[PDB]
Structure formats: structure tokens, C-alpha cells
Amino acid sequence: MDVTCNIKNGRCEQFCKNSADNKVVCSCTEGYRLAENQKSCEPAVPFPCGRVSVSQT
């Protein structure tokens, strides 16, 4: 099927870049790492930006 950044953000959790052969490259903001599934963003520092970490009850 068609895989591009314009379709569901390339299934990237944060950022998408179009690459070669109908593929995309996902990426994340500072403090996160692209996960082994190649789409998700995992924390790479103790207190990554924009995340709620305190228990919300």
C-alpha cells in the first residue's frame, strides 16, 4: 500500500520525512528516541518534554 508522510503521518508518532522507495523515516523531538518498531517515540532522558509523569490518581 501507499506509505507517505501525508497519509496518517507515515504512521510516525511524532515526525515523518519521505525517503526512498515508497518509505518514510520517522523521528522524534529532543529527549526522545525512535523505538525499535521504527514509528514510536520513547523517552531518552529522565524528564522528556511535554510528558505528564506525576500520577493523575
Partner: protein
């Protein structure tokens, strides 16, 4: 914030409150351990500001608050209060000593220009602050938050006699009752992207808070991301 709810501790850990001549007069957002982003009309080179991060209830010590002095104020280079107090309404505050990042004191993410604009286009963001809880009413003690939908440009224009440029956006509800208000200026408008919040706007101005037919006016952060990243870089 009118029509909002009390934030739980740590729910908006990037929020700050500014204190000066009057306490809790504007909001801001943590860019990094040394830098806050706020509205330029809130600040002025020469007037002494303190920032409080990790705040929740301004009248109770909750053992998460970090107070810092401001050593440098950088209004956007196109801001000119003599011409228009609200155009290019964005400024950066440098802290004297770094914040200690933790679950209660956490930066907001800032995407590149393209993605910040995409995120605003999702159409739904969260605003937060200690501003008025009714038009011309008392200010909040406990941080308030509210989800606001993006309003179409033509509706946004027909709602006020003042000019709304393409670097500003509107948000709020057709029936009113839910809006940012005086004292929330400078605070964040954020968009949640799969559990990570990104800064999409700065709370700027309005007229009658939450009045049916009126909307809150916000600074589009996408237009200023490159300037924010350049000025606040620590490496």
C-alpha cells in the same frame, strides 16, 4: 480561565506563573531549564520579574515550587509596544539559576515550524493559567485548564473590531462560557500528540472573556519557532 477545571498536581508541568509589581499577573511556559516563553506585553526590559515553576495552588506551599529571578528579557525583534501592544506578542525570559527538571517542572516540546503549524491544524488545544475565572472576576488560586477548539478565520475576524493577523489565531466556543481571560496572557496553548504536548500558541488577548460571540486571541508559535530555538539553545 473561565469555564475550566482545576489542574491536578503535575498535569501541566511546563506552566509557569510570573510575579512582578503584582503577583501572578501573566503565565509562561518552560522552554528549558534556563528559559521561559511568554507574551511580550507581559514584560518590559528593566522591570523585575520572578518566575515560579512547579506551582499549583498559589496560596499553599506544596513542596514542588521553584522560584527564579529573570536576568534577561528578549521581546521578539518585531515587537513594538508603541505601535501595537499585541502584534508579535512573544518574549523570552532567561533565568538566573537553572530550574531542576522533575515531574512537576518539565519543558514543553517545541516542534519545527512545519509541524507546529500541522499540530495547530489538528484543531484542539489546551490552555492553562491563574487568570480570571469570570470576566472582571477573581483570579484563580488553583491552576485552571481548558480544551479549546480552533475557530475558523472568518468567524474570528467578524467577532472583534480589532485586527487579527495571520500570525494570530482564535479559539473558543460559539456559545462562549469557556475561554482564556485576563491574567492568563503569556501562558501556553498546547496540542497533545500521542501523549506528548507541543506548544502551538501563546495566550495573548481578548475583550469580554467568555462572552458569547467573542473568542480568545492567541499568538501562532509556528512563526517564531526558529527564533525561540536560536535564542534558548544551551549547547
Amino acid at each position: 480561565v473561565v469555564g475550566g477545571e482545576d489542574a491536578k498536581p503535575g498535569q501541566f508541568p511546563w506552566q509557569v506563573v510570573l510575579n512582578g509589581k503584582v503577583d501572578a499577573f501573566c503565565g509562561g511556559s518552560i522552554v528549558n531549564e534556563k528559559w521561559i516563553v511568554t507574551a511580550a506585553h507581559c514584560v518590559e526590559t528593566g522591570v523585575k520579574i520572578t518566575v515560579v515553576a512547579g506551582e499549583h495552588n498559589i496560596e499553599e506551599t506544596e513542596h514542588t515550587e521553584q522560584k527564579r529571578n529573570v536576568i534577561r528579557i528578549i521581546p521578539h525583534h518585531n515587537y513594538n509596544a508603541a505601535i501595537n501592544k499585541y502584534n508579535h506578542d512573544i518574549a523570552l525570559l532567561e533565568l538566573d539559576e537553572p530550574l531542576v527538571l522533575n515531574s512537576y517542572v518539565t519543558p514543553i516540546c517545541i516542534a519545527d515550524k512545519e509541524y507546529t503549524n500541522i499540530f495547530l491544524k489538528f484543531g484542539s488545544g489546551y490552555v492553562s493559567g491563574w487568570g480570571r475565572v469570570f470576566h472582571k472576576g477573581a483570579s484563580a488560586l488553583v491552576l485552571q485548564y481548558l480544551r479549546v477548539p480552533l475557530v475558523d478565520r472568518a468567524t474570528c475576524l467578524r467577532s472583534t473590531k480589532f485586527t487579527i493577523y495571520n500570525n494570530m489565531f482564535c479559539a473558543g466556543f460559539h456559545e462562549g462560557g469557556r475561554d482564556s481571560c485576563q491574567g492568563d496572557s503569556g501562558g501556553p496553548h498546547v496540542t497533545e500528540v500521542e501523549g506528548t504536548s507541543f506548544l502551538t500558541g501563546i495566550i495573548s488577548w481578548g475583550e469580554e472573556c467568555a462572552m458569547k460571540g467573542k473568542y480568545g486571541i492567541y499568538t501562532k508559535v509556528s512563526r517564531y519557532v526558529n527564533w525561540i530555538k536560536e535564542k534558548t539553545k544551551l549547547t
